[PDB]
Amino acid sequence: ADELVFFVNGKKVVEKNADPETTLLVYLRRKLGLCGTKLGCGEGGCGACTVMISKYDRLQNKIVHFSVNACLAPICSLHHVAVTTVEGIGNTQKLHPVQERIARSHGSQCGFCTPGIVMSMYTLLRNQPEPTVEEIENAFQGNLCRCTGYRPILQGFRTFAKDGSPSLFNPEDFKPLDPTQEPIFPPELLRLKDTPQKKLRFEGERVTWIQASTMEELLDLKAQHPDAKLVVGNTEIGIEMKFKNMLFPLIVCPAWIPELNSVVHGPEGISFGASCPLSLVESVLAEEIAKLPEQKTEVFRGVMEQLRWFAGKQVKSVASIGGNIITASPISDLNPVFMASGAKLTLVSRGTRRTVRMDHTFFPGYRKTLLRPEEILLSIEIPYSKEGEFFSAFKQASRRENDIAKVTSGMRVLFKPGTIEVQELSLCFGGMADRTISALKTTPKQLSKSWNEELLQSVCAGLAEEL
Amino acid sequence: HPFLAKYKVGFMKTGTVVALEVAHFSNGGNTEDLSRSIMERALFHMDNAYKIPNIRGTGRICKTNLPSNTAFRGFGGPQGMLIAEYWMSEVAITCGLPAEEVRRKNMYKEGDLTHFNQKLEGFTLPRCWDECIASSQYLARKREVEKFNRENCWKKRGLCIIPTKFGISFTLPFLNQGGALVHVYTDGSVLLTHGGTEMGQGLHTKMVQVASRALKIPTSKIHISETSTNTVPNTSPTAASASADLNGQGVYEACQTILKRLEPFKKKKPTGPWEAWVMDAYTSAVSLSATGFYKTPNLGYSFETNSGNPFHYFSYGVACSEVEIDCLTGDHKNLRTDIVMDVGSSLNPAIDIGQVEGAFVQGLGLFTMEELHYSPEGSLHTRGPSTYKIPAFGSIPIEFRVSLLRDCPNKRAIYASKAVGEPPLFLASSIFFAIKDAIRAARAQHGKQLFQLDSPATPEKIRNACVDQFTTLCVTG
Amino acid sequence: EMGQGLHTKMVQVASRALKIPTSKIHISETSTNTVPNTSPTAASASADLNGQGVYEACQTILKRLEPFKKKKPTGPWEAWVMDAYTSAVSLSATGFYK
Amino acid sequence: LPAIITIQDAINNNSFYGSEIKIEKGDLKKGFSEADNVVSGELYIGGQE
Amino acid sequence: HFYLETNCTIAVPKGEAGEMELFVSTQNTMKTQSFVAKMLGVPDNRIVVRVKRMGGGFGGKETRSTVVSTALALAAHKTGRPVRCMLDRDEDMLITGGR
Amino acid sequence: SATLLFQKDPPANVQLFQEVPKDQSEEDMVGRPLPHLAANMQASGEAVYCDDIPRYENELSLRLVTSTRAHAKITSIDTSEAKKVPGFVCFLTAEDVP
Amino acid sequence: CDDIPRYENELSLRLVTSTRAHAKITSIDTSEAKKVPGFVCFLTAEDVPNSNATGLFNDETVFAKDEVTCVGHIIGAVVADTPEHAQRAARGVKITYED
Ligand SMILES: Cc1cc2nc3c(=O)[nH]c(=O)nc-3n(C[C@H](O)[C@H](O)[C@H](O)COP(=O)(O)OP(=O)(O)OC[C@H]3O[C@@H](n4cnc5c(N)ncnc54)[C@H](O)[C@@H]3O)c2cc1C
Ligand code: FES
Ligand code: FES
16 A cells, blocks of 8 residues: 565565655665665766666566666655666676676776766666667766766677777686576566556655556546646656755656557657656657658658757656656757647546647747646557658757756648649757747748748848747 | 856967966955865966966956865866966967967977976876877878868868866865874784775775885785774875875874884795784784874975975876867767876776766866756755756766876885876866867858857857857847 | 873973973873874873874984084073074974884 | 955955066067967956865 | 673775774774785784774783774675674673683 | 767877896886786775775774854854764864864 | 764674583574564674683684583674664573583
8 A cells, every 4th residue: 555665686675664756766775775876966967876777667568777867766656666786787796797897997087987887887788788888888978977088898898899108907817698697587576467456555744646557547636636746757757856946745657557658659640648757759750750751750860850869768768758848848859749740649637638739829928738637648640741841950969057948849841742832841849048039920921832942041141030 | 166267378470389478366254264275286387388488477366155166186276277278279370370289389399498497307297298199190080070061062071180288286275285194903913004094086995006116015904994083193185186196105104113023023934824923023012003103394385485395296197088079068978088198107097087977077077077056146046956967977078088197206106106186187178178179160151250158158158159140140140 | 091191291292392381281182193104092001102203303404403403502492492493494293102 | 344255356456466477478569560460359267166 | 701792893884995993991092903905814914903992901902902892894795884792791791701 | 060079089009118128137126017016906996095085993084173254163062963974973173183 | 971872784792602601512402583674684603713811911712612601601602783683682592512
C-alpha cells in the first residue's frame, strides 16, 4: 500500500516511510552510505550522479537498462526497479573493464566525474556490448569533466568499439570484457512482474505521492483534486522544487499507466503516449526513418534533429514527451516542431476526451496551455509528411537565461502538387517571446507564391518586422 | 577577473613593433583578495612572446558591488596575453603580411631582456614554434583553408598559430617555499606528506615518483595519505603551477636526510635489503623521521626600479588551431589543434600531457563558450550548467595532437622538470584567433578591416560580426 | 598522557628551551603519523626521553631564529617568527634522543 | 545604496583597490613618432567560473 | 591495574588503500600500529594510531591493549564501517592480565 | 554547405613525449607515465572526497544566507519563519563571532 | 576514547572468550546470536586476512584456533549495531570444548 521496495546493487531495499521529496542520490549517499555517486549540479547537466536502472518492461516483455541522473530521480518513482551504482560493477580488488580502462588511460584526474562517466559507459555496454565510436561519444552528452579535456577518456574507451615516442598506456594489457559476468536481474523482480501493480501512496513531511496504476485512478484523482501535480520523469518539477522553491503538496505519478506509454501507428502518423520517454520517441522514429521512404519522414527527422543536441542519455531515458509539451517553456525545442507540423494532441479527463491540432492557441501565456485543471495530455500524434511537404528544425546552441531567449524553430511548407507554389507555410519559434509562437502575419502573405528569391526576401522582411 | 584594455601600438611596414601603450582595468568585486597580484601578472605578460623596445603598461583594479573575483588558472596571464595577441593580429592585418611571420619576427631571442628587465635564458620558444609549424603542416594547411573559403560562401575556416611565455613563481617572493615530512616505519614502509594539496593535477603521484628516486626504493613502499597543517605548517597555497617544484625539493631534502642517516648501515650491508638497513637504524636508535624544506632563491622584483627577477624560469609553448565557422548561426567546429609544450624533462609525461590538455580545454572555454551574465543591478543570472556552458566531450578539437619538447632539461627545478599547470591555458587563444580569421573571410565574402571581436567569441559574437544581408536587415530595413 | 602529567612537563621543558610562556605552547595528542617508531610510555622513562626530544627540536628552531633575534634583540617573539616566515625559513623541526 | 557594478562605473567613481600599477621602458614618444603606422582600440574579456 | 578507564579502541576504516585510523587507550601506539598492520597484511604507513589521553595505564596498556585494538581493526576492515569496543570491568580484569 | 546537417569526422589524436634513458632503473619512475595513484579508486568510487566522509550521529548541517542586493543597508532580519522549520537550531550573524 | 561521538554508521564489538583453562574447540554455534536484533557477524580466526600470530614475541593468537589456553582466551568477536545487542548476541555464541 505503502512500502517502497527496490534493489540496489543486487540487494533488496525496503523503505517503510518513503518521503516523496527524497532523491535517489540522497538515499544512496545518506541512507545506504554509497558515496561513489556524486553531487555536481543537482540540475541534470553534469552527470556526476549517473547510475543505471534495470527493470522488467511489461509493455515489451523484456529486461531493459538505462542511465539516469540520481539527483533528479524521486525514490518514490522507483518501486520494483533495480539500481546499479559504481560500487555495483566492481572495486579496486576486481575492477570492471570500464573502470580499469578509464583509470589506466589517464582518463581520471580529480576523479569527481569518474563514477558518472563510468556508469554512462557501463550502461552503453549493457545495451550494446560492441558500440561504434559514435555511440561511445554520444553516451557522454550528459557528462561533464573539468580536468581531462576528454581526449584520454574517449581514447581509452575506443578499445570497446567494433570500429576502432612511447605510448601513454598499453591497451593489450586491459582485461577483456565478458558480458555474461554482469549481475543477474533480481529474480524477485521477475517473480513480481506477474503480480498486478496497484496504487501506492507515500506520505512525506510536506508532500503526498500517489503512484497511479490505471487511467481510472489518475482521472479520478484529477477530477476530485485538480491541484494534483503530475510528475513523470521529474526533470522539470525536480528543478522547480530544488531551485525555484515551489511546493506541490499532492503529486501523482502516472508512469506505470499503459495507455500513457503506448506507441500506435495510424494512417496520419505515430501516436505516442504522453509519458513515453524521449529515448523511446528517438528509438521509434529512428526505425521509422530507416524503413520508410524519405517523403514520409520529414517531420520525424525534424524531431530527431531537435533531440540530437538535447541533454544526454540520462535525461532522455526519463524526460517524457508530454512533460516537454506541458512544461510549455518559451525555449522548448519540441513545441515549435509540434506547432509547425500541427501535431494532434488528445486531452482527457474523467468523462471528457478531445483533440486539438497544436497551433498558436495551444499556448495562451507564459508557461500555460489550454488544458483544463482536471485534464491530462493522453497522447501526441507525430504526422507522416505528405508528398510535396518539407520540414526543417533549427536551434541556437548557446543559452543565457533559465527559460527564455534561445531561438529554436520548426518550419514546414506544403506545395500544391506538381508545383513549386505554396499551399501551406508554417514558421514557429521558441525564444522570441514568453511562449512558442507562429509567424502568422508573415506566412499567410506567401500562399500561392512560387518558391523563389521574391519569396525569400518577402519572408525575411516579414520576420524582421513581425519578430 | 574580467578585463577591459585600451591599447595603442606603433609599428613599421615590415610588422616590427616599435611602440606600445596599454591601460588595463580588471573587475575585482567587493574585496581585494588576490586582484592586485593578478593585475601584476597581466602586466608581466603584456609582451607575451614579443620584444618591444618602447612600452608602457598600466593596470587599475576596480572595486565594485560584485562577488570578489579571485585566482583562476593563469592568474591574469591569459588576460594580459590575449590583449597582446589581439593588437598583434591587427598589426599583421594592417601590414598585409602573414601573421605567422609578423609574430616570428617580433619574438624575443635568447638573452633578450623583458619589459621588466628579466633575462630570457634557455629560451626554447623558437624550437616549440619551428616544431609546431612542421608537425602541424601549417603552410600547406593555410592553402587548404584559403581553398575551402573560395569554395564555400556560408561556412569558412580559419587557422592560427600562437606562442606563449609564462613566468613561473609566486609574484610575492616569500610564497615560493615548501615543506615535507617523512617517516620510515620499522617494516620499511614510508609515509610521506608535504604542503601541496591534490586537486586532480597528480601532485601526490609526482611526489611519490620523486621520493622513490631520491630514496632508491620502489613507489610501492611510499604512501601519501593527506595534507595537514599539523604535519607541515605555514604552507603556501597549491597554486601558481609551482607546487611540484616547491614540494619536490622539500621531499627530496627530507629523503636525503634519511639517506645520510642510513649510510653507515648501507656500508656494513651493501647487498642486504632496504628493510634490514631500516631495522638496523631503529635498533641502533637512529631517527627515521625528517623534515625537508625549500625556498626558490634570488627572487624579488621592484616596480619602483623595474629590476629584480619575479620568476625563477619561464614555461614556453605553441599551438596551431583550425576551425570551421557557420556564418549563418555563429556555431563552429574545432577541427584540429597541435601543441608543442616545453615542460623540461617531465616528471610524468602522462600527467603533464593531461595538464596541457585540461589547461587548453579550460582556455577553449574562457575564449569561446563560458559567459557569465548579470542583471543591471548586479545579480548573477548564470548559476548552473543549463546557462553556463563549459566544454563538453563534443567541444574538443577533433584532431588533437600534443608533443612534449625533447631534450630541454631545466636545471633549476626538481630533476630538471618544469611546471605545467597554467602555461598551456592561454594557447587556446589559437582557437579564438582562428575564429577571428574565419570571421574576416566571411566579411570579405560580403563583400571595415579591424572589426571588433571581444572575448568570449560566442555564437552571438561570431554571428553578429559576420555582416551580411540578414544582419543588415535586422539592424535596419 | 595517562595522568602522570607528561604533557605538562614537556610544555614546561619547551617553554624554557624556547624562552616563551607555556601559554604559547600546546600539545593536542600523540600520533604515529607525527612521531614514528616510538617506545611505550613505560619504565618511568618517558619525561627523560621525550624531554630531550623536545629540547632538541626547540634548539633547532632557536638556531634558525638567531639571525632575526640578533637584528631585533627587543621586539617580540611574534616579530622574529613572522620575519623568519617572510624570509622563507622553516619553522618545523623534529627532535630525537637516545 | 548607490551601486558600482561595471568597470566603467568604477572608473568614473574613482573606485579602485589602491593605486595604478605600471611598467614602462624606452621612449614612448620617440617610438610612436618614428612608427610607420599607429593602431588604437579596445578589448573586453569576460570572466570565468 | 584497575585503571579507572578500561581498555577501549575505535577503528575508522577510510576505504582507500587499506588506510585505517585508530583511537586507542594505549601506552604503545607503535606496537598497536604494527599488530594491526600485520593482521590486515598492509604496510605500517596505512595505519595511524592516535592517543589523546588514557584514564590510567600503569603498564597494563603497554601491550595488552592490542588484543582489543586488533579485534576492532578487523571488524572495521570487514564491515567498512567504524567499530568501537570499550571493555566492561569484568572483561578487562579477566582478559588483560596483571602483575 | 549551408544546408548540410552537423557531421563529426573520425577523431585522430597523437601524444608525443620522450622515453627515459635506457639505463634508468625500472624502479625509477621519474619521467615515466605512471597513472595517477588514485585513478583506480576514483573509477571505483572508493576515493573519499569531503562530503563522502561519514556523518557523526550528532552532526549538524549549515546553510548560508546571502544578500539579494548589490549595495544596501540591512534594516531588519526576521527569523520567525526559520524557527518553525523542524530541526532548526540557530541563525548565526556578525554578533555571534567570538 | 569512548567520549568521542559515534559516527552514524558505527558498530559495536563484544569479545567472546574461553570459559576453559585448556581445551580443544570442538564446535561453535552462532544460531542464537543471529536472532539477536542488530547482529552483523561473528569474527573468528578464519576472518583474519593475513596473520593470526600477534603479541610481542609472536606466540599469541588474535583469535583462538583449535585450542583455548586460559579462561579469558579470546575466541572471536560479535559485531552488532549497539553494545547491548553485542552483549546479547555474545551470550548466544555457544562453544563446545574437550578439556
Ligand atoms: C539537463 C536538462 C537538459 C534539458 N534540455 C532540454 C532541451 O535542450 N530542450 C528542451 O526542449 N527541453 C529540455 N529539457 C527539458 C526536458 O525535455 C523536460 O524537462 C522533460 O521533457 C519534462 O518531462 P518530464 O516527464 O521530466 O516532466 P516532469 O518534470 O515530471 O513534469 C513536467 C510538467 O508536465 C506536467 N505533465 C507531465 N506529464 C503530463 C501529462 N501526461 N499531462 C499533463 N501534464 C503533464 C507535469 O505536471 C509538469 O508540470 C532539459 C531538461 C534537463 C533536466
Ligand atoms: S548532480 Fe549534476 S546531473 Fe545530477
Ligand atoms: S577528472 Fe576532474 S571533473 Fe573529470
